[PDB]
Amino acid sequence: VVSIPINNAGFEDPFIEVVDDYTVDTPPGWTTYNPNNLVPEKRTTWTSNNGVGYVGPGTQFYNQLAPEGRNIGYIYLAQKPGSGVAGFEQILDATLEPDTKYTLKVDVGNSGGEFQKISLAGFPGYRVELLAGDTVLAADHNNLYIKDGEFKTSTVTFTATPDNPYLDQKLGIRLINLLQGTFSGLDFDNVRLTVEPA
Amino acid sequence: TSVVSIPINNAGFEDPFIEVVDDYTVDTPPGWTTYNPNNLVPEKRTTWTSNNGVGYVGPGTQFYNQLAPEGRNIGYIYLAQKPGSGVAGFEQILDATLEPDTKYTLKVDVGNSGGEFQKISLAGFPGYRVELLAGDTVLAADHNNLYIKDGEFKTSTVTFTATPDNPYLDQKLGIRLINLLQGTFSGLDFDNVRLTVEPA
Ligand SMILES: [Ca+2]
Ligand SMILES: [Ca+2]
Ligand SMILES: [Ca+2]
Ligand SMILES: [Ca+2]
Ligand SMILES: [Ca+2]
């Protein structure tokens, strides 16, 4: 298996010392996908936000450690369901090539438990996107059922043919909070993109 | 309490009957509506406008190395606009409603037609999305997850579990079968839509 490198693919940057502590700024190496302007430029704990969080022993949110390393990346949206979507985006240096099969995998987390006496029960729905340029080549729109406190792996594959219109455009990844339910937060971890001849 | 099929109108595009092999309609199949969020499909269609309809895929067909997945006919969507211009396809709202503690399984066969039509190559594929709705909300969707070679069909499967806390319970279920217009030749076929519900 041959990987395409991704920056901060496991959200391990930055290091977080205290269990369940978190940042509220875009993880290094990623940008905030914000097509509906739901996430402000300047965040608090309680605005719509995204960032990184440490899942270790003593976590109140999960029934297992982080899928990879210490940290997961989270997206929280405070607007009512139906208001739009937001998430993580990363554009890669690798470009779409013909007769090549791409396999994107990411672990999707449904945080459970309670935060400042607010229940995290429920899930907003997720979408995992593989891009060339601004085009979604293939995407998993919420196909996995993920219970509170658990993670499941989403897998998206795509084969580009010689006649594909998007050849030579940069590959990208989006990890999206759909805001289709409450509690309206979800987590991602361990992003992997691998490539093989068709 | 067990696996039940939810009824869908004209679910194999068998209405209308078509006598000549590879003959087709260019109007919205009975029981479905034209999903047209980017206004790509005109209200009146001819062969080479953007359109949708049904087509007979039987012995003699120039478009597939297999017969129609179900019965005689498939349903198709063709888009004349350039890649990137938008999407269009089929939509059907069902009488059934979203119920809690249930698992839904939507299956449809997706066809990448091959061959030639009026010296126009059918090689290539626009991409598809299959959507399960409640009300206006796409609960789960297969956005082009299967690779489908020219001249074959593959079955797309979408599942969704509805919890007691789902915001859209009691809203009408719906189905969308979408041409993504992300490639040429910019037509694709669908057949054999099935929706089941079972305790979760
Ligand atoms: Ca990690
Ligand atoms: Ca949750
Ligand atoms: Ca896992
Ligand atoms: Ca049929
Ligand atoms: Ca084709």
PDB file of C-alpha atoms in Angstrom, chain A residues 4-198:
ATOM      1  CA  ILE A   4      -0.188  10.029  -0.352  1.00  0.00           C
ATOM      2  CA  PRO A   5       1.154  12.234   2.451  1.00  0.00           C
ATOM      3  CA  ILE A   6      -1.320  14.387   4.408  1.00  0.00           C
ATOM      4  CA  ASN A   7      -0.329  17.079   6.905  1.00  0.00           C
ATOM      5  CA  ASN A   8      -1.465  16.552  10.520  1.00  0.00           C
ATOM      6  CA  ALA A   9      -3.378  13.488   9.327  1.00  0.00           C
ATOM      7  CA  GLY A  10      -4.139  12.304  12.882  1.00  0.00           C
ATOM      8  CA  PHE A  11      -4.660  15.765  14.445  1.00  0.00           C
ATOM      9  CA  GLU A  12      -1.715  15.070  16.714  1.00  0.00           C
ATOM     10  CA  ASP A  13      -0.587  18.720  16.299  1.00  0.00           C
ATOM     11  CA  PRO A  14      -0.807  20.414  18.823  1.00  0.00           C
ATOM     12  CA  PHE A  15       0.064  18.301  21.822  1.00  0.00           C
ATOM     13  CA  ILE A  16      -2.596  18.518  24.554  1.00  0.00           C
ATOM     14  CA  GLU A  17      -1.546  17.572  28.078  1.00  0.00           C
ATOM     15  CA  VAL A  18      -4.815  17.222  30.031  1.00  0.00           C
ATOM     16  CA  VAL A  19      -7.394  14.582  29.079  1.00  0.00           C
ATOM     17  CA  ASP A  20     -10.504  15.959  27.314  1.00  0.00           C
ATOM     18  CA  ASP A  21      -8.876  19.392  26.906  1.00  0.00           C
ATOM     19  CA  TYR A  22      -9.173  20.894  23.441  1.00  0.00           C
ATOM     20  CA  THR A  23      -8.300  23.771  21.163  1.00  0.00           C
ATOM     21  CA  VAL A  24     -10.837  25.988  19.429  1.00  0.00           C
ATOM     22  CA  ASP A  25      -8.792  27.020  16.392  1.00  0.00           C
ATOM     23  CA  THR A  26      -8.358  25.290  13.034  1.00  0.00           C
ATOM     24  CA  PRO A  27      -5.882  22.388  13.350  1.00  0.00           C
ATOM     25  CA  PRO A  28      -2.470  23.085  11.815  1.00  0.00           C
ATOM     26  CA  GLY A  29      -2.254  21.861   8.236  1.00  0.00           C
ATOM     27  CA  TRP A  30      -6.048  22.058   7.753  1.00  0.00           C
ATOM     28  CA  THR A  31      -8.439  24.844   6.817  1.00  0.00           C
ATOM     29  CA  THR A  32     -11.988  25.327   8.044  1.00  0.00           C
ATOM     30  CA  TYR A  33     -14.524  24.352   5.399  1.00  0.00           C
ATOM     31  CA  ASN A  34     -17.152  27.017   5.886  1.00  0.00           C
ATOM     32  CA  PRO A  35     -19.540  27.232   2.903  1.00  0.00           C
ATOM     33  CA  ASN A  36     -22.429  28.582   5.012  1.00  0.00           C
ATOM     34  CA  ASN A  37     -20.352  30.939   7.200  1.00  0.00           C
ATOM     35  CA  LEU A  38     -21.512  29.042  10.290  1.00  0.00           C
ATOM     36  CA  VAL A  39     -18.072  29.138  11.978  1.00  0.00           C
ATOM     37  CA  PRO A  40     -16.638  32.513  13.088  1.00  0.00           C
ATOM     38  CA  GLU A  41     -13.044  33.588  12.521  1.00  0.00           C
ATOM     39  CA  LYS A  42     -12.632  34.088  16.270  1.00  0.00           C
ATOM     40  CA  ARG A  43     -13.972  31.251  18.404  1.00  0.00           C
ATOM     41  CA  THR A  44     -14.908  30.449  21.969  1.00  0.00           C
ATOM     42  CA  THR A  45     -15.711  27.168  23.677  1.00  0.00           C
ATOM     43  CA  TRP A  46     -19.327  27.797  22.778  1.00  0.00           C
ATOM     44  CA  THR A  47     -19.323  29.343  19.312  1.00  0.00           C
ATOM     45  CA  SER A  48     -19.434  27.010  16.378  1.00  0.00           C
ATOM     46  CA  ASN A  49     -15.821  25.899  16.246  1.00  0.00           C
ATOM     47  CA  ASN A  50     -13.298  23.209  15.373  1.00  0.00           C
ATOM     48  CA  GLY A  51      -9.950  22.113  16.710  1.00  0.00           C
ATOM     49  CA  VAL A  52      -8.178  19.193  18.310  1.00  0.00           C
ATOM     50  CA  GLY A  53      -8.941  17.236  21.477  1.00  0.00           C
ATOM     51  CA  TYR A  54      -7.041  14.698  23.604  1.00  0.00           C
ATOM     52  CA  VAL A  55      -8.762  11.346  24.203  1.00  0.00           C
ATOM     53  CA  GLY A  56      -6.906   9.408  26.873  1.00  0.00           C
ATOM     54  CA  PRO A  57      -7.630   7.372  29.981  1.00  0.00           C
ATOM     55  CA  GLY A  58     -10.260   9.174  32.003  1.00  0.00           C
ATOM     56  CA  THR A  59     -12.071  10.561  28.993  1.00  0.00           C
ATOM     57  CA  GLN A  60     -15.720  11.334  29.656  1.00  0.00           C
ATOM     58  CA  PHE A  61     -16.694  11.274  25.947  1.00  0.00           C
ATOM     59  CA  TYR A  62     -15.668   7.925  24.463  1.00  0.00           C
ATOM     60  CA  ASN A  63     -15.656   4.231  25.248  1.00  0.00           C
ATOM     61  CA  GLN A  64     -12.208   3.787  23.703  1.00  0.00           C
ATOM     62  CA  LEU A  65      -8.963   5.687  23.234  1.00  0.00           C
ATOM     63  CA  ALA A  66      -8.451   7.799  20.109  1.00  0.00           C
ATOM     64  CA  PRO A  67      -8.243   5.636  16.958  1.00  0.00           C
ATOM     65  CA  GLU A  68      -4.695   6.956  16.387  1.00  0.00           C
ATOM     66  CA  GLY A  69      -2.260   8.669  18.747  1.00  0.00           C
ATOM     67  CA  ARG A  70      -3.626  10.969  21.459  1.00  0.00           C
ATOM     68  CA  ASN A  71      -5.858  13.429  19.616  1.00  0.00           C
ATOM     69  CA  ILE A  72      -8.940  13.608  17.449  1.00  0.00           C
ATOM     70  CA  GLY A  73     -10.225  16.562  15.447  1.00  0.00           C
ATOM     71  CA  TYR A  74     -13.691  17.840  16.251  1.00  0.00           C
ATOM     72  CA  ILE A  75     -16.289  20.135  14.699  1.00  0.00           C
ATOM     73  CA  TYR A  76     -19.093  21.639  16.775  1.00  0.00           C
ATOM     74  CA  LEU A  77     -21.955  23.690  15.292  1.00  0.00           C
ATOM     75  CA  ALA A  78     -24.235  25.757  17.529  1.00  0.00           C
ATOM     76  CA  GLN A  79     -26.783  26.738  14.853  1.00  0.00           C
ATOM     77  CA  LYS A  80     -30.032  24.786  14.599  1.00  0.00           C
ATOM     78  CA  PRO A  81     -30.160  21.682  12.374  1.00  0.00           C
ATOM     79  CA  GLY A  82     -30.755  22.598   8.732  1.00  0.00           C
ATOM     80  CA  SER A  83     -28.591  25.744   8.902  1.00  0.00           C
ATOM     81  CA  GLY A  84     -25.785  24.431   6.685  1.00  0.00           C
ATOM     82  CA  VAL A  85     -22.529  22.487   7.046  1.00  0.00           C
ATOM     83  CA  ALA A  86     -18.918  23.067   8.115  1.00  0.00           C
ATOM     84  CA  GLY A  87     -15.794  21.035   8.653  1.00  0.00           C
ATOM     85  CA  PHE A  88     -12.150  20.423   7.806  1.00  0.00           C
ATOM     86  CA  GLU A  89     -10.534  20.769   4.391  1.00  0.00           C
ATOM     87  CA  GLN A  90      -7.016  19.996   3.185  1.00  0.00           C
ATOM     88  CA  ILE A  91      -5.719  20.450  -0.375  1.00  0.00           C
ATOM     89  CA  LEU A  92      -2.810  18.121  -1.144  1.00  0.00           C
ATOM     90  CA  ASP A  93       0.191  18.452  -3.434  1.00  0.00           C
ATOM     91  CA  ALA A  94      -0.655  15.235  -5.296  1.00  0.00           C
ATOM     92  CA  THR A  95      -2.826  15.643  -8.399  1.00  0.00           C
ATOM     93  CA  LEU A  96      -5.483  13.433  -9.941  1.00  0.00           C
ATOM     94  CA  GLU A  97      -3.905  10.950 -12.361  1.00  0.00           C
ATOM     95  CA  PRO A  98      -5.647   8.651 -14.865  1.00  0.00           C
ATOM     96  CA  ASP A  99      -5.885   4.858 -14.520  1.00  0.00           C
ATOM     97  CA  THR A 100      -5.280   5.225 -10.803  1.00  0.00           C
ATOM     98  CA  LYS A 101      -7.462   4.089  -7.905  1.00  0.00           C
ATOM     99  CA  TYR A 102      -7.552   6.253  -4.773  1.00  0.00           C
ATOM    100  CA  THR A 103      -8.706   4.995  -1.357  1.00  0.00           C
ATOM    101  CA  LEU A 104      -9.574   7.534   1.365  1.00  0.00           C
ATOM    102  CA  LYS A 105     -10.135   6.289   4.913  1.00  0.00           C
ATOM    103  CA  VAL A 106     -11.021   8.270   8.014  1.00  0.00           C
ATOM    104  CA  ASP A 107     -12.341   7.309  11.437  1.00  0.00           C
ATOM    105  CA  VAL A 108     -15.565   9.114  12.364  1.00  0.00           C
ATOM    106  CA  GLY A 109     -16.352   9.628  16.034  1.00  0.00           C
ATOM    107  CA  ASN A 110     -19.643  10.168  17.830  1.00  0.00           C
ATOM    108  CA  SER A 111     -18.794  11.800  21.153  1.00  0.00           C
ATOM    109  CA  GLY A 112     -20.939  10.820  24.103  1.00  0.00           C
ATOM    110  CA  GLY A 113     -21.227  11.887  27.708  1.00  0.00           C
ATOM    111  CA  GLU A 114     -21.723  15.406  28.996  1.00  0.00           C
ATOM    112  CA  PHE A 115     -19.931  18.764  28.760  1.00  0.00           C
ATOM    113  CA  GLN A 116     -20.656  21.509  31.306  1.00  0.00           C
ATOM    114  CA  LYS A 117     -23.894  19.627  32.090  1.00  0.00           C
ATOM    115  CA  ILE A 118     -24.886  19.651  28.376  1.00  0.00           C
ATOM    116  CA  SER A 119     -25.579  16.187  26.970  1.00  0.00           C
ATOM    117  CA  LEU A 120     -23.531  15.121  23.956  1.00  0.00           C
ATOM    118  CA  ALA A 121     -26.112  12.415  23.152  1.00  0.00           C
ATOM    119  CA  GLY A 122     -27.104  12.407  19.488  1.00  0.00           C
ATOM    120  CA  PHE A 123     -25.223  12.923  16.252  1.00  0.00           C
ATOM    121  CA  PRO A 124     -25.317  15.555  13.457  1.00  0.00           C
ATOM    122  CA  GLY A 125     -24.359  13.280  10.577  1.00  0.00           C
ATOM    123  CA  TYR A 126     -21.090  13.317   8.639  1.00  0.00           C
ATOM    124  CA  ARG A 127     -19.783  13.500   5.091  1.00  0.00           C
ATOM    125  CA  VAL A 128     -16.317  12.442   3.916  1.00  0.00           C
ATOM    126  CA  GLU A 129     -15.285  13.896   0.508  1.00  0.00           C
ATOM    127  CA  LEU A 130     -12.471  13.128  -1.931  1.00  0.00           C
ATOM    128  CA  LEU A 131     -11.841  16.119  -4.193  1.00  0.00           C
ATOM    129  CA  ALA A 132     -10.036  17.107  -7.344  1.00  0.00           C
ATOM    130  CA  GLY A 133     -10.001  20.877  -7.384  1.00  0.00           C
ATOM    131  CA  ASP A 134     -13.416  21.977  -6.113  1.00  0.00           C
ATOM    132  CA  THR A 135     -15.167  18.847  -7.470  1.00  0.00           C
ATOM    133  CA  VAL A 136     -16.358  16.078  -5.138  1.00  0.00           C
ATOM    134  CA  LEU A 137     -15.205  12.928  -6.984  1.00  0.00           C
ATOM    135  CA  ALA A 138     -16.758  10.491  -4.505  1.00  0.00           C
ATOM    136  CA  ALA A 139     -18.177  10.932  -1.026  1.00  0.00           C
ATOM    137  CA  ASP A 140     -19.607   9.001   1.897  1.00  0.00           C
ATOM    138  CA  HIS A 141     -22.650  11.014   2.972  1.00  0.00           C
ATOM    139  CA  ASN A 142     -23.444   9.576   6.415  1.00  0.00           C
ATOM    140  CA  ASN A 143     -23.627   5.901   5.396  1.00  0.00           C
ATOM    141  CA  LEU A 144     -22.375   4.470   8.722  1.00  0.00           C
ATOM    142  CA  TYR A 145     -24.389   4.248  11.933  1.00  0.00           C
ATOM    143  CA  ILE A 146     -22.130   5.334  14.821  1.00  0.00           C
ATOM    144  CA  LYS A 147     -23.407   5.106  18.415  1.00  0.00           C
ATOM    145  CA  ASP A 148     -22.544   7.609  21.148  1.00  0.00           C
ATOM    146  CA  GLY A 149     -19.035   7.016  22.442  1.00  0.00           C
ATOM    147  CA  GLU A 150     -17.809   5.048  19.402  1.00  0.00           C
ATOM    148  CA  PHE A 151     -15.763   5.418  16.207  1.00  0.00           C
ATOM    149  CA  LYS A 152     -16.220   3.735  12.819  1.00  0.00           C
ATOM    150  CA  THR A 153     -14.003   3.842   9.704  1.00  0.00           C
ATOM    151  CA  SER A 154     -15.391   5.472   6.532  1.00  0.00           C
ATOM    152  CA  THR A 155     -13.923   4.346   3.208  1.00  0.00           C
ATOM    153  CA  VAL A 156     -14.227   6.262  -0.060  1.00  0.00           C
ATOM    154  CA  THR A 157     -12.708   4.963  -3.313  1.00  0.00           C
ATOM    155  CA  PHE A 158     -12.458   6.465  -6.775  1.00  0.00           C
ATOM    156  CA  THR A 159     -10.889   5.447 -10.097  1.00  0.00           C
ATOM    157  CA  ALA A 160      -9.994   8.184 -12.597  1.00  0.00           C
ATOM    158  CA  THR A 161     -10.190   7.300 -16.267  1.00  0.00           C
ATOM    159  CA  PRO A 162      -8.139   8.912 -19.070  1.00  0.00           C
ATOM    160  CA  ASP A 163     -11.203  10.979 -20.056  1.00  0.00           C
ATOM    161  CA  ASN A 164     -11.832  12.388 -16.587  1.00  0.00           C
ATOM    162  CA  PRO A 165     -12.291  16.192 -16.807  1.00  0.00           C
ATOM    163  CA  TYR A 166     -10.423  16.862 -13.540  1.00  0.00           C
ATOM    164  CA  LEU A 167      -7.078  15.232 -14.301  1.00  0.00           C
ATOM    165  CA  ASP A 168      -4.028  17.155 -13.045  1.00  0.00           C
ATOM    166  CA  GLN A 169      -6.041  19.103 -10.448  1.00  0.00           C
ATOM    167  CA  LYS A 170      -4.893  18.897  -6.845  1.00  0.00           C
ATOM    168  CA  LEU A 171      -6.459  16.211  -4.673  1.00  0.00           C
ATOM    169  CA  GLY A 172      -8.287  17.347  -1.558  1.00  0.00           C
ATOM    170  CA  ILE A 173     -10.176  15.977   1.445  1.00  0.00           C
ATOM    171  CA  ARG A 174     -13.188  17.350   3.314  1.00  0.00           C
ATOM    172  CA  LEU A 175     -14.470  16.066   6.676  1.00  0.00           C
ATOM    173  CA  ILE A 176     -17.926  17.577   7.159  1.00  0.00           C
ATOM    174  CA  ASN A 177     -20.411  18.065  10.019  1.00  0.00           C
ATOM    175  CA  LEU A 178     -23.840  17.869   8.349  1.00  0.00           C
ATOM    176  CA  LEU A 179     -25.807  19.631  11.157  1.00  0.00           C
ATOM    177  CA  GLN A 180     -28.718  17.191  10.724  1.00  0.00           C
ATOM    178  CA  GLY A 181     -29.253  16.420  14.395  1.00  0.00           C
ATOM    179  CA  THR A 182     -28.267  17.264  17.960  1.00  0.00           C
ATOM    180  CA  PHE A 183     -25.950  17.137  19.830  1.00  0.00           C
ATOM    181  CA  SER A 184     -24.334  18.776  16.792  1.00  0.00           C
ATOM    182  CA  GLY A 185     -20.722  17.746  17.292  1.00  0.00           C
ATOM    183  CA  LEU A 186     -18.625  14.990  15.799  1.00  0.00           C
ATOM    184  CA  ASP A 187     -14.978  13.967  15.596  1.00  0.00           C
ATOM    185  CA  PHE A 188     -12.554  12.649  12.974  1.00  0.00           C
ATOM    186  CA  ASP A 189      -9.212  10.850  13.203  1.00  0.00           C
ATOM    187  CA  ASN A 190      -6.543   8.934  11.298  1.00  0.00           C
ATOM    188  CA  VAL A 191      -6.983  10.258   7.768  1.00  0.00           C
ATOM    189  CA  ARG A 192      -5.333   7.967   5.213  1.00  0.00           C
ATOM    190  CA  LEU A 193      -5.111   8.323   1.425  1.00  0.00           C
ATOM    191  CA  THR A 194      -3.505   5.539  -0.583  1.00  0.00           C
ATOM    192  CA  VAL A 195      -3.084   4.951  -4.292  1.00  0.00           C
ATOM    193  CA  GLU A 196      -2.632   2.056  -6.695  1.00  0.00           C
ATOM    194  CA  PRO A 197      -2.746   1.408 -10.445  1.00  0.00           C
ATOM    195  CA  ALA A 198      -6.279   0.797 -11.638  1.00  0.00           C
TER     196      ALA A 198
END
